[PDB]
Design a protein around this ligand. Structure first.
Ligand SMILES: C[S@@+](CC[C@H](N)C(=O)[O-])C[C@H]1O[C@@H](n2cnc3c(N)ncnc32)[C@H](O)[C@@H]1O
Length: 281
C-alpha cells in the first residue's frame, strides 16, 4: 500500500535541480541558483564533520549520490551510502564508479538498521523523517557505536512542534498543521514521522553525544520549496504524462503546503551536529 506512492526518477527531475537533491538548499549568499544552493548545503553539512583525507564517510539516506561524490572530490575520503530505493541505488552506483579517485566508494541497498561497519563520520540529510519515533534510541546508539573516539555526525531534518507548542498559535491552525503533517507522512514519505528539534537533540544526548545549538534552515526551505513548486507547475503537462493528474496534484499540495507552513512558522528544518566525547575542538 505504501508502494502505491512510489514515483519514477522521471517525475522528480521535473522539479529538482540537476544534482537531484531532495532536501532544503542553502542560499548563502542569497543570490545562488537552486543548483548552487544545493552544493552550498552539502558543503554546510560536510564542513561540520572534521573530515580528513583517507577517512570513511557514511551517508545514511544517500539519495542520488551528490553528497557522496562531493565529499570524495572535496575531502579525498572513502564513502559508503545507504538507501532503500532500488532506483537511487542504481544511479548512485553509476555516479560513484565514475569518480576519478583511488578512494573506496560503495552504495548499499539497506537501512541503517542493517549497517554495522566501522566508519569515521556520518552525514544524514532528510532521511531521519522516515525512521519513526520508536527507532530513535537505536539510531543514535548505532551511530555512536560505529564511529571512533573523535566521531561526528550531522542530521538535517524537517521538524514539527509538540501539539502543546502548536495550540499556543491557536487551535484552528494547530489541527490543520497536524493534518498536513499526516498527509506528508502518508502520501509523500509513507511510514514517516516528523520529529521535533527537541527529540533530535535529546535522543542524541541520551546516546552520549555532545549537541551544540541546532541550526534552523526555515528561510532557506521557504525559497527551496517556492522554486520546486514553480518548476513542477511549469512542467505540468510533462509531469502528468510521466505519472498522472493524481501524482501532480499530490506533489503541488505538498510543495505549496510546505512553503505555507514554513512561512507561518508551523514547521522548521534543523541541522543538528552530534559530537562524540573525543571529537576535535
Ligand atoms: C528525501 S531523500 C534525501 C536524500 C538525500 N540525502 C538528499 O539530500 O537528496 C530520503 C533518503 O532516505 C533514505 N532512507 C529512508 N529510510 C532509511 C533508512 N532506515 N536507512 C537508510 N536510508 C533510509 C531513502 O531511501 C532516501 O535515499
Amino acid at each position: 500500500i505504501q508502494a502505491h506512492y512510489d514515483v519514477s526518477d522521471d517525475f522528480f527531475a521535473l522539479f529538482q535541480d540537476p544534482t537531484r537533491t531532495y532536501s532544503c538548499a542553502y542560499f548563502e549568499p542569497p543570490e545562488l541558483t537552486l543548483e548552487e544552493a544545493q552544493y552550498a548545503k552539502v558543503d554546510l553539512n560536510l564542513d561540520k564533520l572534521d573530515l580528513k583525507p583517507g577517512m570513511t564517510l557514511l551517508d545514511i539516506g544517500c539519495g542520488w549520490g551528490t553528497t557522496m561524490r562531493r565529499a570524495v572530490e572535496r575531502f579525498d575520503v572513502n564513502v559508503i551510502g545507504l538507501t532503500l530505493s532500488k532506483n537511487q541505488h542504481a544511479r548512485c552506483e553509476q555516479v560513484l564508479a565514475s569518480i576519478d579517485t583511488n578512494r573506496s566508494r560503495q552504495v548499499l541497498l539497506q537501512g541503517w538498521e542493517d549497517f554495522a561497519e566501522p566508519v569515521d563520520r556520518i552525514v544524514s540529510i532528510e532521511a531521519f523523517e522516515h525512521f519513526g519515533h520508536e527507532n530513535y534510541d537505536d539510531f543514535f546508539k548505532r551511530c555512536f557505536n560505529i564511529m571512533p573516539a573523535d566521531g561526528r555526525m550531522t542530521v538535517q531534518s524537517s521538524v514539527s512542534y509538540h501539539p502543546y507548542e502548536m495550540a499556543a498559535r491557536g487551535k484552528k491552525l494547530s489541527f490543520e498543521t497536524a493534518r498536513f503533517i499526516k498527509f506528508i507522512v502518508t502520501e509523500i514519505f509513507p511510514g514517516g514521522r516528523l520529529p521535533s528539534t527537541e527529540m533530535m537533540v535529546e535522543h542524541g544526548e541520551k546516546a552520549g553525544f555532545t549537541v551544540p545549538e541546532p541550526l534552523s534552515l526555515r528561510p532557506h526551505y521557504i525559497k527551496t520549496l517556492r522554486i520546486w513548486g514553480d518548476t513542477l507547475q511549469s512542467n505540468k503537462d510533462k509531469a502528468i504524462e510521466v505519472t498522472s493528474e493524481e501524482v501532480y496534484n499530490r506533489y503541488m499540495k505538498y510543495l505549496r503546503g510546505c512553503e505555507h507552513y514554513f512561512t507561518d512558522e508551523m514547521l522548521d528544518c534543523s541541522l543538528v551536529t552530534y559530537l562524540k566525547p573525543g571529537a576535535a575542538a
